[PDB]
Each structure stands twice: as C-alpha cells, then as structure tokens.
Amino acid sequence: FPATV
Amino acid sequence: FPATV
Amino acid sequence: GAMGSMERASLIQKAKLAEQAERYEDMAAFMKGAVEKGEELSNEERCLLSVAYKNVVGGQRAAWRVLSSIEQKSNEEGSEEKGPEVREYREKVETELQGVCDTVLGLLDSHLIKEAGDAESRVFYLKMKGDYYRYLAEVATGDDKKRIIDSARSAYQEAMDISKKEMPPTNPIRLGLALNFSVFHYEIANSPEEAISLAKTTFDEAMADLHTLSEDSYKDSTLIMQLLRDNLTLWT
Amino acid sequence: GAMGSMERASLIQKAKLAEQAERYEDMAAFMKGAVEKGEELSNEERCLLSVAYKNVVGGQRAAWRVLSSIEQKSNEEGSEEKGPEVREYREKVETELQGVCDTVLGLLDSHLIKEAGDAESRVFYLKMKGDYYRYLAEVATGDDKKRIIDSARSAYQEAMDISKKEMPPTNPIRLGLALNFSVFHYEIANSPEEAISLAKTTFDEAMADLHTLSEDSYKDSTLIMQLLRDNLTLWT
Numbered sequence A, B: 001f002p003a004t005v
Numbered sequence C, D: 001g002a003m004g005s006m007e008r009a010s011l012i013q014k015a016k017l018a019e020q021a022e023r024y025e026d027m028a029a030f031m032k033g034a035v036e037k038g039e040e041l042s043n044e045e046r047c048l049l050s051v052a053y054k055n056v057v058g059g060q061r062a063a064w065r066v067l068s069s070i071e072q073k074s075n076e077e078g079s080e081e082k083g084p085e086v087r088e089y090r091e092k093v094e095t096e097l098q099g100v101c102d103t104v105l106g107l108l109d110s111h112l113i114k115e116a117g118d119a120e121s122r123v124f125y126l127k128m129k130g131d132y133y134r135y136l137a138e139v140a141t142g143d144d145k146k147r148i149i150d151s152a153r154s155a156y157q158e159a160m161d162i163s164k165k166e167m168p169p170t171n172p173i174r175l176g177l178a179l180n181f182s183v184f185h186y187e188i189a190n191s192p193e194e195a196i197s198l199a200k201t202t203f204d205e206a207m208a209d210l211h212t213l214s215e216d217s218y219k220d221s222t223l224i225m226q227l228l229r230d231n232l233t234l235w236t
C-alpha cells in the first residue's frame, strides 16, 4: 500500500 | 519478561 | 457522551497515556470526549485526535483487507462452498469501520470545521474529512459510492485550495494533504496520472522552499517529502 | 450470551478468520460463544480459545505495565503532582484485565474443567486456570492477594500431578505447563530457586525422551525446551 499520513 | 506459552 | 463527566484537561492527559500504552481505542474515546467539550483544539490536540483514529481505522482497514481477500478467493472457480461466514464477518468488520468513520466525520461536522479559521486548523480538518470519506470509499459498493468518492474529493480540494494560498510549500500539513490526495487519485478515483503529477509537483515545490527553513523544520518537511518520493517510486 | 444465535461451527470458523485478521477480541468473543454451546472442545478448539485470550490479556498486561511504571515515577520524590488521572487510567485498564481473567476462569469453571477427563484436555485447562489466576495476582494488592496466588498455585499443581503421571516428559502441554509454573514461582511466589529447579529438571527429562519422537514431534518439543533454556539463561 502507498504511504499516507 | 520471561517466556510463557 | 460517556466522557461528559470528565474534565477536558484530564481527557487530554489520558489520551496521551493511552498513546504511551498503545491503547488507541481508549485514546480515540478520550479525544472524542475532549472534542465534545465544544472548545477548539490546539495543534497538539488535533494531532492526538488524528493519531488515535488513524490507528483505530488503520487496524480495521488491515483486517477488512485480509477478510476481503479470503472472500474473493472463496468466490473463485473450483473453490469449495464454505457458507455465509466469511461474508458475514467481513461485513461485521466493515460496519464497525464505517461506524468509526461516521464518528470522525460527525466530530468534524459538529463542529470542528465550522469553527476552524486558521489555515493550520482548517486544512488539517478538511484533510481528515477527505481521509475518512476515502476510507468509506474503500469499502463502498452501493448507490451512494460515487457520492462518497465525491465527498472525499471535495474536502481534499477545499483543503488544497486553502493550503496553496495560505501555507508555504514545505508546511508539513500541506505536504501530508497532498500525499493523501495523491493516494486518493491513484487508489480511489482511478486517476494515476493525476496522482503522479500531484506528488511530483508537490515534491519539487517543497524542494525549492527548503532553503528558508531551520534544521528542525527541514527535518519535518523532508520526512513527508520522502513519503511522496516513496509513492512515486511505487507508481513509476 | 450474545453469540447464542450463531452455530457452533460458524463460531469456530469465524474465530479462525479473526485470528487471520489479527482481531483477537473478536476471536475471544467467538470462542467464548463456542464454549457456551456446552460441548467439549477438541484439541484445536482449545488452542483457539487459548490463543484468543492470551493475546487479549497480553495486550492488557503490557498496557498495565506501562501505566504502572508511569504511576510509580509520579510517586517518587521531586515528582510534580499530576492529579488522579494516571491512577484512574491504570485502574481502568486493571479492571478490564480482571474482567477478562474472570471471564476465562468462569468458562473453565462452567464447565470445561469438570468435563475434561483426558490428560491433554484436563492439564491444558488447569494450566489455563493457573495462568489467569497468575495474571490476577500480577495486579492484586488487597486482602485476597494471598488467596489469588494460592489459587494459581493449586491449579498449576493439579495440572503438574496429572501431567507427570499421564504424559511423556516431552509432551508440549506438559512442557508449557512447567514453563509457566516456573515463571509463577519466579515472578509471583518469590521462589526463584524453585523456578530454576523446575525449569532445569523439566528440560533435562525432556532431553532424555527426545529419542522416542518423530521429526515433527521433536520440533514441537524442542521449541518449548528452548523457552525453558531462555528463562534459565535470564535467571542464572
């Protein structure tokens, strides 16, 4: 999965 | 901590 | 409101303790209680609220993905019928996830966003609104799916508009908003080119503004810029 | 019983799914429902019950230790008064932990132990009874603390007596019982010599019986024997 914050 | 199962 | 009898300051203090103890459901309940006191939140308090719910919903999303994968495999050809249980349990986790998202969106709508006038608070809350609609979109399949996606898009877009007018390109909230909206484009809106363009332009504009920053601010900004780069590497 | 309307087999199936999704509270609730159907549990079902509650209570214990450490530091000299909140939140987690332990002990008493006649089931359940009284003892400070410790000791001792008569020295349940009873001696009963003696004798008697085992049984037994050795290394 891609990075999110 | 010591090991328990 | 089960936290109605506890002092605001005590709720914040216990949220911090719950974080130290990795008790994120408790942390979220304490922060919900703090929000429901009706006062605006400080920068640190907004972080506590976001950390708490990000961890709760993140665990739910991870579990939903495991169960959805099992359910998909159970529906392939040659698979042996195992009954309604996988679907039922995936639905249970899904309904709990939706409940958490609805709770967060409810706090944002009643009344955090409407009282947030500074860019650092308003952008942060609108980003959260986009994020929680995005998590609803990940599990949505009904008549309202397009409206859920559009609600995420609209919140992110309002946050973006404010952030570009009122924040420097290295502001970590602006960067994190762009990171997440780019992920929205890639994973939710089937717009990988928009996702890539947004991540790249955000990264490049931040790079050009790093020269203005102290060492500590530089560390904060470059941390998020690296996440943009990580996603670009995944996608290209 | 909230799980009263769900089939036993469906509860077991969902417990396995919950384990795959790392949803241990759900797993425990499903296994509690299965136990409450009133039938005996198979070897695999006993494992599911134990894994579920071990993970739930293990997380509670870890959180309790974090909070207890903060509370101890808040009571040292030179520490600034921070109010009742640390104690209150430690007490909240403690009460939840005690509730889980009481639930497990209740399932064992109503009526798993009394129907367990084979050594593999009876030893396993009596070991669990010792374990959950041990977790109660870790947090106990009242008039009943010595009785809680003695309840753990008594359950472990009955399990030990059966295990030595009815199981080979390499049986993994016998080994795990001895591992945990040794930890009880060291951490709860202030009996480090008994803890060390038990771990060493258990290890040596298992070593001498490994020659009787298949490759797969050997792997199972040596895994637990290594935990005994690890504790001996910690303690000597």
Ligand SMILES: CC(C)Oc1ccc([C@H](N)O)c2cc(C(=N)N)sc12
Binding pocket: C019, C043, C044, C045, C047, C048, C051
């Ligand atoms: C100081 C205020 C504005 O709030 C933060 C700023 C930076 C951080 C992190 N250290 O960069 C942080 C972590 C937090 C937490 N997890 N409780 S609150 C928080």
Ligand SMILES: CC(C)Oc1ccc([C@H](N)O)c2cc(C(=N)N)sc12
Binding pocket: D019, D043, D044, D045, D047, D048, D051
């Ligand atoms: C086959 C039956 C008697 O039950 C087990 C035996 C061995 C194991 C482990 N693989 O050694 C195991 C793990 C389990 C789980 N966590 N759901 S049940 C289980």
Ligand SMILES: *SCCNC(=O)C(C)(C)Oc1ccc(Cl)cc1
Binding pocket: A005, C046, C047, C048, C050, C051, C124, C127, C172, C173, C174, C175, C176, C177, C223, C224
């Ligand atoms: S608000 C929680 C504290 N911040 C963080 O954990 C990191 C990820 C380091 O910074 C950001 C979080 C959220 C945003 Cl919108 C931006 C940076």
Ligand SMILES: *SCCNC(=O)C(C)(C)Oc1ccc(Cl)cc1
Binding pocket: B005, D046, D047, D048, D050, D051, D124, D127, D172, D173, D174, D175, D176, D177, D223, D224
């Ligand atoms: S019952 C859960 C499956 N078993 C295990 O996870 C390990 C730790 C490998 O084996 C034992 C667990 C419990 C006992 Cl009493 C003995 C071995």
Ligand SMILES: [Mg+2]
Binding pocket: none
């Ligand atoms: Mg007040």
Ligand SMILES: [Mg+2]
Binding pocket: C091, C094, C095
């Ligand atoms: Mg649904």
Ligand SMILES: [Mg+2]
Binding pocket: none
């Ligand atoms: Mg644009």
Ligand SMILES: [Mg+2]
Binding pocket: none
């Ligand atoms: Mg029936």
Ligand SMILES: [Mg+2]
Binding pocket: D091, D094, D095
């Ligand atoms: Mg108490």
Ligand SMILES: [Mg+2]
Binding pocket: none
């Ligand atoms: Mg003896």
